[PDB]
């Protein structure tokens, strides 16, 4: 039975490839020849946040563009005031080996986790005034690679046990599992309408997951190497991914194939983080080259570089209004660009 | 404003606590323990006492933090980079596993998987700034098994008496040491067992020597 199922799967994949070629009347670069380029990028550092003792791994902007949360190896989950460089919180962790973090859209909760296989959710708005553990979502056999809030009741996580999960915060149990990947899942990026998200994994293929239905809608086997980071395009019909093969790939959901490859002759290092600008015109990507590259997402040309870090770049984010760019590296510094 | 100034004062208080935690982090030394469940690592930890698992313990005034990641089912390539700041990497493997095979029940020894892991971890560029410690467990069980089962089935390159447990120890040690292609680094080896209470002094001495070698390299004295 196995051989006939494999032959049917191969025929279905060939039909998908034939449909993708059939609808590929043009690429993105063949119609952007009539639009002006972005030109020179002259962004400068506005703030430097110096409060970390060891390697920074993750950050997430708040929806008010004023507060940010960052995670680091030293066991402090630090919440920063972006305007006055004040330290808002320095939350001690039970397990210092943290890889990801998230900030709730209401500002009431934060999430964290790592090699402990537990997603810890902390309450920022308590009667006691201190930040304490509210939930310990232990349900994985591999490392917790990414968490993002939908609200104060539901959180979407992806981990290293090939499973993605929708967790119910109030109950403490999983709402649903997403057992579609074959390798460790590294990152997820949520749609602004909270209905869909995109996850990527070591099997070099991105998957679109439906939060409520529990099924995968699209599989994109367009990569040569491990997918590291994903950022969703603001209009809800596209996304961009990064990987170890030094090519940043812009995918379109409705086209069901890739729109554009980003590569350059002097880049041989993998991609660790990606983010979009407010309009989606400028794509930001962090590399092992110790800098963050500004790429013109429509013209395909290299727009600029922000090089204010000494160690490997680990995290990159943009405010919801596009006001500021934040970068963080293993050198225990954060930088804010504008 | 008054709220701005109070927020700055609270930030300074947080910075004071961060400085205290920085001092404690300097005092703390991280240690990574690698190995599988069948190596008897729980008995090793029991001897050392007197998700990711933390094992803090104290010396007379030196604080050690042993890290056990062996419970996790994952691909090491996409998370092991966070252990660059570990002073020395410890590999705990048993000497009695040559009669045992992998879960696939094929013609592959668990020692071959251990060697593959050994070379895979050493060839990572993040760990080429630290030392390697090799713990060879179950030496008494090795002594019993070499008489039960002769040292012939997995060892085509062995030259010595087939019942000589010391020759077995030295040969397995030599095969492990020869796997390191970088002459800049040294492997600190120890022969341990379930009743060996001196493992903590081996760890202390090996970590001290690692720190001294890192200092001598940093000082451009060698």
């Amino acid at each position, epitope marked *: 039975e196995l051989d006939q199922l494999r032959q049917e799967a191969e025929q279905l994949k060939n039909q998908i490839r034939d449909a993708r070629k059939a609808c590929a009347d043009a690429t993105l670069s063949q119609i952007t020849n009539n639009i002006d380029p972005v030109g020179r990028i002259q962004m400068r550092t506005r703030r430097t946040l110096r409060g970390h003792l060891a390697k920074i791994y993750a950050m997430h902007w708040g929806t008010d563009s*004023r*507060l940010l949360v960052s995670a680091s190896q030293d066991g402090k989950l630090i919440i920063w*005031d972006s*305007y006055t460089t*004040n330290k*808002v919180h320095a939350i001690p962790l039970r397990s210092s080996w943290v890889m990801t973090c998230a900030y709730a859209p209401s*500002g009431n909760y934060v999430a964290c986790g790592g090699l402990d296989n537990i997603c810890s959710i902390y309450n920022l*708005k308590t*009667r*006691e*005034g*201190n930040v304490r553990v509210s939930r310990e979502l232990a349900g994985h056999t591999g490392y917790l690679s990414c968490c993002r809030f939908l609200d104060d009741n539901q959180i979407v996580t992806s981990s290293g046990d090939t499973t993605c999960a929708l967790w119910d915060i109030e109950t403490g149990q999983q709402t649903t599992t997403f057992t579609g990947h074959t390798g460790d899942v590294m990152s997820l990026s949520l749609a602004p309408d909270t209905r869909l998200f995109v996850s990527g994994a070591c099997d070099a293929s991105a998957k679109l997951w439906d939060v409520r239905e529990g099924m995968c809608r699209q599989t994109f086997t367009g990569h040569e190497s491990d997918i590291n980071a994903i950022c969703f395009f603001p209009n809800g019909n596209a996304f961009a991914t990064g990987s170890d093969d030094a090519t940043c790939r812009l995918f379109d959901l409705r086209a069901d194939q890739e729109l554009m490859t980003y590569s350059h002759d002097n880049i041989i290092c993998g991609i660790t983080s990606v983010s979009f600008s407010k309009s989606g015109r400028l794509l930001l990507a962090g590399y092992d080259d110790f800098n963050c590259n500004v790429w013109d997402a429509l013209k395909a040309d290299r727009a600029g570089v922000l090089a204010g870090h000494d160690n490997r770049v680990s995290c990159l984010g943009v405010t919801d209004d596009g006001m500021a760019v934040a970068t963080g590296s293993w050198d225990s510094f954060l930088k804010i660009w504008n | *404003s*008054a*709220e*701005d*100034k*109070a*927020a700055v*004062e*609270r930030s*300074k*208080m947080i910075e*004071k606590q961060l400085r205290r935690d920085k001092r404690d982090a300097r005092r703390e030394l991280k240690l990574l323990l690698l190995g599988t469940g069948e190596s008897g690592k729980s008995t090793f930890i029991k001897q050392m006492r007197i998700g990711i698992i933390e094992y803090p313990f104290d010396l007379e005034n030196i604080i050690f933090r042993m890290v056990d990641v062996g419970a996790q089912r994952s691909e090491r390539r996409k998370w092991i980079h966070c252990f660059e700041n570990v002073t020395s990497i410890m590999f705990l493997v048993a000497l009695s596993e040559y009669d045992q095979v992998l879960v696939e029940s094929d013609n592959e020894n668990r020692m071959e998987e251990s060697k593959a892991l050994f070379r895979t971890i050493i060839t990572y560029p993040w760990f080429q700034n630290s030392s390697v410690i090799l713990f060879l467990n179950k030496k008494d069980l090795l002594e019993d098994k070499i008489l039960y089962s002769h040292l012939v089935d997995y060892f085509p390159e062995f030259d010595g008496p087939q019942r000589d447990a010391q020759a077995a120890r030295e040969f397995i040690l030599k095969m492990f040491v020869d796997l390191n292609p970088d002459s800049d680094k040294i492997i600190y080896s120890h022969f341990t067992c379930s009743t060996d209470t001196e493992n903590i002094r081996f760890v202390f001495a090996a970590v001290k020597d690692t720190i001294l070698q890192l200092n001598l390299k940093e000082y451009n004295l060698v």
Partner: single-chain antibody, 231 residues
Framework: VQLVESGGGLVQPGGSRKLSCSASGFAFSSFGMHWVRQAPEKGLEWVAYISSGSGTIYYADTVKGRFTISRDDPKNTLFLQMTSLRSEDTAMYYC??????????????WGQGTTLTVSSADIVMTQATSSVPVTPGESVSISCRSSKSLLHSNGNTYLYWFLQRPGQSPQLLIYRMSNLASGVPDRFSGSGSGTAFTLTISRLEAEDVGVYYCMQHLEYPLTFGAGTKLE
């Protein structure tokens, strides 16, 4: 989350007393602490502030040089040493906890209170109306004026609104005129300019009886309004 106060009673003029405030149920050491006073025929008058870690201390102009504020974090107890006591210092005293940062909710818990009986450039807060008779279910608009503009260059206007029910300690209603305090129902709101303030109440409940305070937090010393009662 309790604050149990002691060290009060009836004293003679010229004496001294040590007040205590026992804190329980919360992370006391991270909080700033206030002492607040209220005469029987007057509204609340702010006395003193000590920051977390004792990094800074502030006194009112009529308080400085006579009263000493102190704290003991490992026993979670606040102290106040008051010397040269005058007849004007007879008041109900309150132990108050606060946290100051962007998005925080300071003054969200007021203590039990204690009774002590004794045998120029500041911003003045004006509430001309002493009381308004009301009917449940109707809306209410209560104004407040400040002598200075409270609009800082960061965009925030540092006005707070409080409710002091009869026989109860004051409860926080609104801070910075946009962020409703936790535990307070959504029928309360505020609005206004940098100097002219309005508290708007829709669908008034019986439990809303009490004295309403407006307060400025632009510069130290802190000052309180006269207070408007709903009858």
């Amino acid at each position: 989350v309790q604050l149990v106060e002691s060290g009060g009673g009836l004293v003679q003029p010229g004496g001294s007393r040590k007040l205590s405030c026992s804190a329980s149920g919360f992370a006391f050491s991270s909080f700033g602490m206030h002492w607040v006073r209220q005469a029987p025929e007057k509204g609340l008058e702010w006395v003193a502030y000590i920051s977390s870690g004792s990094g800074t201390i502030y006194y009112a102009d009529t308080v400085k040089g006579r009263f000493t504020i102190s704290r003991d974090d490992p026993k979670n107890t606040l102290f106040l040493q008051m010397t040269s006591l005058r007849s004007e210092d007879t008041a109900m005293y309150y132990c108050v906890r606060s946290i100051y940062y962007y998005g925080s909710s300071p003054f969200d818990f007021w203590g039990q209170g204690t009774t002590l009986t004794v045998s120029s450039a500041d911003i003045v807060m004006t509430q001309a109306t002493s009381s308004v008779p009301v009917t449940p279910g109707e809306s209410v608009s209560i104004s407040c004026r400040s002598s200075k503009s409270l609009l800082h260059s960061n965009g925030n206007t540092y006005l707070y609104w409080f409710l002091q029910r009869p026989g109860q300690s004051p409860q926080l209603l609104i801070y910075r005129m946009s962020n409703l305090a936790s535990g307070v129902p959504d029928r309360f709101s505020g609005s206004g300019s940098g100097t002219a303030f309005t508290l708007t109440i829709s669908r008034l409940e019986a439990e809303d009886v009490g004295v309403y305070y407006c307060m400025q937090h632009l510069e130290y010393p802190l000052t309180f309004g006269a207070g408007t009662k709903l009858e």
